């Protein structure tokens, strides 16, 4: 009955947009100091090693969107983190889903891409100490 | 390939440890 | 084993503000506009009709956040735009979602909050050319 | 609290309908 997804998509946007602007506002000076420091880190990774964090959107296949290998790619992750979990790694990981969500987008309507995000933060900060003893050490 | 990830990971952080110094 | 939720927010937003800005960059040229004239309009029904968006929000009891209740609210908006699916009751509803998130927030872990979305912002774009006369007309 | 809520809304839809003029 004559729908028009060009409305859908910017009432989309715009809520999430609106509700980014409010979880802004919730952090805390010491989280934005946090995400200050990461931010400058994970973009400094996505210049310098773009040629390797390329090369495993490669061996993820992240062209495929698909819920089954959107869930493969998790696993994958959370599993190398699991056996790999120094903080260095875990800001290429970072990195590596700043990658993934410019190369297909996320507008929250990809449900599996929300429990990525979700359970490989929550491993990031696991043994929180050891990452923010790697951060502060690296902006001297 | 799962060991082929955790390669490429492991030297992206090998990498950025020495560059730590 | 030493976790910290600090990290862990400060990430899931940094990954959804990456994931916001490719959005927008694929938002054509007619989206664009359209996203503009939303604001706009759902920003002076937020000034207007701010006591009235308030009572919706009182009586739909939005500060309760649990999952019983935000399907209780997305039903209830559901239901209110079949029996009331007129441009300015759509362009209210988008002002009131806008006014509940930005009063409990929404980092997408909340996955009821983003189904309410994309099923209001799908009931919305029915019947496009409805909607689409009512903004045109507004901006003279 | 149903036809409460169409209520409130209805009226934003009305004043909404005749400021467009
Ligand atoms: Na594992
Ligand atoms: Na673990
Ligand atoms: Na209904
Ligand atoms: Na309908």
């Known amino acids: 009955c004559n729908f028009n997804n060009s409305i859908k998509n910017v009432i989309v946007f715009y809520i999430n947009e609106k509700a980014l602007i409010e979880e802004k506002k919730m952090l805390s000076c010491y989280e934005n100091?946090?995400?200050?420091?990461?931010?400058?880190?994970?973009?400094?990774?996505?210049?310098?090693?773009?040629?390797?964090?390329?090369?495993?959107?490669?061996?993820?296949?992240?062209?495929?969107?698909?819920?089954?290998?959107?869930?493969?790619?998790?696993?994958?992750?959370?599993?190398?983190?699991?056996?790999?979990?120094?903080?260095?790694?875990?800001?290429?990981?970072?990195?590596?889903?700043?990658?993934?969500?410019?190369?297909?987008?996320?507008?929250?309507?990809?449900?599996?891409?929300?429990?990525?995000?979700?359970?490989?933060?929550?491993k990031i900060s696991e043994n929180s100490e050891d990452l923010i003893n790697f951060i502060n050490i690296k902006n001297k | 390939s799962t060991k082929k990830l955790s390669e490429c990971l492991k030297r992206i952080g090998d990498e950025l440890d020495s560059n730590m110094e």
Not at chain 1, 35 to 46: A, G, Q, Y
Not at chain 1, 61 to 71: G, M, P, Q, R
């Open chain 1, 33 to 122: 100091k946090l995400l200050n420091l990461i931010k400058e880190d994970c973009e400094n990774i996505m210049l310098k090693y773009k040629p390797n964090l390329s090369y495993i959107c490669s061996l993820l296949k992240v062209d495929d969107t698909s819920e089954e290998n959107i869930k493969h790619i998790k696993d994958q992750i959370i599993e190398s983190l699991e056996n790999d979990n120094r903080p260095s790694v875990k800001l290429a990981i970072i990195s590596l889903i700043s990658m993934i969500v410019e190369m297909n987008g996320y507008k929250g309507k990809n449900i599996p891409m929300s429990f990525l995000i979700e359970d490989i933060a929550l």
